[model samples]
Target: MKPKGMTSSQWFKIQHMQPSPQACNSAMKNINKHTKRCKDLNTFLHEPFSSVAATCQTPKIACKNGDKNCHQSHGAVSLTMCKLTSGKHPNCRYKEKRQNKSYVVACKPPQKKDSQQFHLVPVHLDRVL
Candidate 1:
């Protein structure tokens, strides 16, 4: 069953957003629970949601799927990367590393009827630049 009432942007937050570094062992465990597989690699942004969302106003670029909503941050931001070392579903393991890098994310208009937050909000991480 789908996660009830969860939006794509909300899911994006759970997958990529982390205001600070979190241990890969626990973080990757949650990811596996949600995805039902051991993800090979994942990057977590150590920036506030509003800050990352602000990048959407910078400029637009094509996403991996050719969507024009993608935007790259102007400066490098803190990040923690989780890489799968060894795993088999519930027995997953990971490696974590911290770095600073510019990242690209895809934004979209608010999906709510009565929204007042941002003009465009990041929904998908395109890549780290």
Candidate 2:
């Protein structure tokens, strides 16, 4: 994919993409393990999603006189109210690798997933910074 002129099919070939004879056998075992085989993937399965509430508080910090990015003040304290959008968060964006007609997805490491939290803990305290 990194090379400018490669197609997905070409990438697959490079990775030795070939149908395995054992695929059907494994699939058969998995199919039998399922209690019921539903043809549709969109069948209504369960209740809608939901999240819990959280609270955080820090003292009015010193040395943070007028910096908007500073979490603490030079003796003045402030409360930060970060209300999450909803009880539950949005489906976290994850990295997906395509294999044939399916995707092998994984949650990106928290550090890589959101660039915002890189120095979240250290920068949070003026002394640490």
Candidate 3:
């Protein structure tokens, strides 16, 4: 279902929009349909926990740029990976991922904008292991 103030198609359109942190935040505000719910969107976005299943094995995740702050890992995560590309010789593709997992959560302090803040923003993925 679409979030309040949005039409059905509008919601999906925003969901599939160009991949970026900003776009992820925009899509998240309108994603209200879920099982267990949280009062704080930032907490919901940031905390490392499970969803569909009761538990998941903790995985070690490393920083893509080697940022130690995000090296820690949690879970049955909800993950989204989006790619933006240019049709050229060396295609340019930017992939942005959104997930809720177990972590030494590396989120910064809340921002001035509510829509732009999450208590546990993710910094990396652990698919390599």
Candidate 4:
């Protein structure tokens, strides 16, 4: 018996005998697809914790190593960080700079939970300090 008290391979026998080969193939394909998707989703669900954690500090393009706000949103690593922007987000900014005689817009935001404060650093790291 399985965990729910149903015997293992009980429903499976009926599927093998009553169905045509094509029907069985289709059913098997669906089951395989569902199983793969479930596994993929299971793996994907745990990935954000690490991804946000790694990027939460100093982000990739802003701030310094030890400022309180430099850690970005107080270091809890919330997924909502992705939604932040200069217009409506708590930890974001809009930047425009000249590149090859054209203006470019960049949105650099924080990546932690809603607790810390950060300020605008208009100067890009690529430019000489």
Instruction: Identify the superior model by lDDT, candidate 1 or candidate 2.
Output: 1
Which TM-score value belongs to model 3?
0.26
Task: List model 4 lDDT by residue over 40-127, tens digit each.
Answer: 1000011222232333344433344332322232232111101112332121232322112111111133223322342222111111
The alpha-carbon lDDT assigned to residue 56 of candidate 2 equals: 8
**C-alpha lDDT values of all predictions:** 0.84, 0.22, 0.33, 0.23
Put down candidate 3 lDDT per residue, 1-129, tens digits, no spaces.
335654422332333323334543334433433322211222222322222111122233335555443334333334454444322222223345666444333222233332332343332232311
Alpha carbon deviation, residue 93, candidate 1 (Å)? 0.5
Model 3 clash pairs are 42-119, 46-120, 48-101, 73-102, 74-102
Q: Model 4, 2: alpha-carbon shift in Å?
A: 7.4
Cα shift from native, residue 43, model 3 (Å)? 20
Write the candidate numbers in order of decreasing TM-score: 1, 3, 4, 2
Rate residue 70 of model 2 by lDDT.
28
lDDT of 1 by residue, 15-80 (tens): 888887789878877777866778898899999988988998988889999878899998999999
By lDDT, rank the candidates, best first: 1, 3, 4, 2
Error of 2 at 48 (Å): 34
List candidate 1 segments past 4 Å from native.
1-5, 113-115
- Report residue 111 deviation for candidate 4 (angstroms): 54
